[PDB]
Design a protein around this ligand. Structure first.
Ligand SMILES: Cc1cc2nc3c(=O)[nH]c(=O)nc-3n(C[C@H](O)[C@H](O)[C@H](O)COP(=O)(O)O)c2cc1C
Ligand SMILES: Cc1cc2nc3c(=O)[nH]c(=O)nc-3n(C[C@H](O)[C@H](O)[C@H](O)COP(=O)(O)O)c2cc1C
Ligand SMILES: O=C(O)/C=C/C(=O)O
Ligand SMILES: O=C(O)/C=C/C(=O)O
Lengths: 312, 312
């Protein structure tokens, strides 16, 4: 019985990693994720220049999940590139580097500089097309023409395999169109489903107030709220992109949740809200719990059940 | 202290009603809703001809909410129109009739016949632009040009005030556009936010199977999953449609949840999943609980806190 995977020309001890944005902004964070039992890690989505992000309070967690409007606070692309070039211990686990430039030009600028490091070190690009928290910037992948432009420009400028972080969709027509756009791009080797469910609103009944400051309280939702949404998107893209990998993200708190993501089609499984709340000790627990479910079912490897969800 | 209110030239004993689709398909259901302590009722979304709907199982409930792909099973518009014209006791409470034709032409045909009954009896139209469960028919209100066409043609054919059942949105640009489309039509006096969060997927770990049969298990989500999304949409439309009413729907299980919807801007509060699971006794409990929160806070009227959610 084993959780090992071999994909994108890298070997992973198990399918778990942080979700971008959680425990991955500073060198301290990345060293922590590296020391954890996770199979991989991804750095904070970055911009060309450092950013302070949105005003605080900008994250709050509750029993059923979290809301945030961080606003892409990050140490800047130079930092994450240097981390990937000089600092990361690749003998420990593979590293993904997430970028979220505020325009196609900014993304293109960054990937031109990332390319030689990706060639040399094997760092893997996750292009974030789904940030719902920057005031005035709608989610790129909710505009299919813009999505195509970004992917055309990034494919041309980068020229290496990469992946895309996708927003959740809620309409079969959108699954069909989105997956078809992705299928136009052979360098897109993995699709991460999903980013936060955008622009939710938590209100505290006692204070009669929204709980985060940016955007009049409107922020991305994660955690228990989003699991069925996340599984639907994982499965929709798994079915529609048979020549790509799908990484699952959304609502994972237990090895059972990870098991459902894998049944739905997930290769790697990312942990956001639960990791933010529990800390990196979560990775040993999710590993044990997934192996227990596999043991009980007689599954010896992940491939034995990946994408094997039954329909009626 | 009582929760009585006036809206749309009708008087309501309290802001509570069923959500369309729940406990409202047959004469028996409608008689049951009428005998309940709800302030109003709405009939099942209907089509010109009766429909058997999607294959069973097609509804499932869980601690955090529900998933369904009913597929508009209904007794046909002739039945709901007859209920409105001949059978409903308007001395008990107001009635909303929901229609969900599968084309603009179908909706136009229905509203032309509804008009004389609305003139005589005061039945209120809720035009459903957000059914996410009929195979091959995308949610109308996710296509803004289609949404405009439907509202143009219905406004012209019907000529009387009406309301619209909206899908949830997740992008500030979409809130802006959707509300601007709605604001083009002075006959649209109310906006119901929200219909189900479309096309989620629930998977049972033990059986390794989806839990509903239609559309490979993909169905609309309601219940605790969707409360922050519901509140966001209620508030977004409340802010952008100052000259219309917003009815809140999504995630109501308690007087506290109703209190939050009303703080976000809700005039009426609809109850779907919780009503499906608890039954019509829920309305007395919700009234008691809302009155208790109001008393504790020193509020004597709904108008005192409606839309008064505080930002930071
Ligand atoms: C604190 C916070 C910051 C995040 N920052 C990013 C980000 O930088 N890039 C990104 O793609 N997603 C970001 N996310 C979204 C997560 O990666 C993930 O998609 C989302 O939280 C859903 O997963 P969950 O249900 O496990 O939380 C962030 C989420 C939160 C909670
Ligand atoms: C069994 C089922 C049937 C529904 N049928 C309709 C329908 O006919 N028309 C409609 O506008 N909404 C329908 N809905 C969606 C609800 O009206 C409501 O918008 C949704 O369930 C979210 O509210 P909730 O969280 O209280 O469940 C239905 C929901 C369920 C649970
Ligand atoms: O930093 C943030 O606001 C989150 C971005 C994201 O969810 O992509
Ligand atoms: O009958 C249904 O499938 C539900 C429709 C809706 O949510 O509008």
């Amino acid at each position: 019985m084993c959780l090992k995977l071999n994909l994108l020309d890298h070997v992973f001890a198990n399918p778990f990693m942080n979700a971008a944005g959680v425990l991955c902004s500073t060198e301290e964070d990345l060293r922590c994720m590296t020391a954890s039992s996770s199979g991989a890690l991804v750095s904070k989505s970055c911009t060309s220049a450092p950013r302070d992000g949105n005003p605080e309070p900008r994250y709050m967690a509750f029993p059923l999940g979290s809301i945030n409007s961080m606003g892409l606070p990050n140490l800047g692309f130079d930092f994450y590139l240097k981390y990937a070039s000089d600092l990361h211990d690749y003998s420990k686990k593979p590293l993904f580097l997430s970028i979220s430039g505020l325009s196609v030009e900014e993304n293109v600028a960054m990937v031109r500089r990332l390319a030689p490091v990706a060639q040399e070190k094997g760092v893997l690009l996750e292009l974030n097309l789904s940030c719902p928290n920057v005031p005035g910037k709608p989610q790129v992948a909710y505009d299919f023409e813009a999505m195509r432009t970004y992917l055309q420009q990034v494919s041309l400028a980068y020229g290496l395999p990469f992946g895309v972080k996708m927003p959740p969709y809620f309409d079969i027509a959108h699954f069909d169109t989105a997956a078809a756009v992705l299928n136009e791009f052979p360098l897109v080797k993995f699709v991460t489903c999903v980013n936060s469910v955008g622009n939710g609103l938590v209100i505290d009944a006692e204070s009669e107030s929204v709980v985060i400051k940016p955007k009049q309280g409107f922020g991305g939702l994660g955690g228990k709220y989003i699991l069925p949404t996340a599984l639907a998107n994982v499965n929709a893209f798994y079915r529609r992109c048979p020549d790509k990998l799908v990484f699952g993200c959304g609502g994972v708190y237990s090895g059972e949740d990870a098991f459902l993501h894998i049944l739905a089609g997930a290769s790697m499984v990312q942990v956001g809200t639960a990791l933010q709340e529990e800390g990196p000790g979560i990775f040993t627990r999710l590993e044990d719990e997934l192996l227990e479910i596999m043991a009980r079912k007689g599954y010896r490897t992940l491939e034995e059940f990946r994408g094997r969800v039954k329909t009626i």
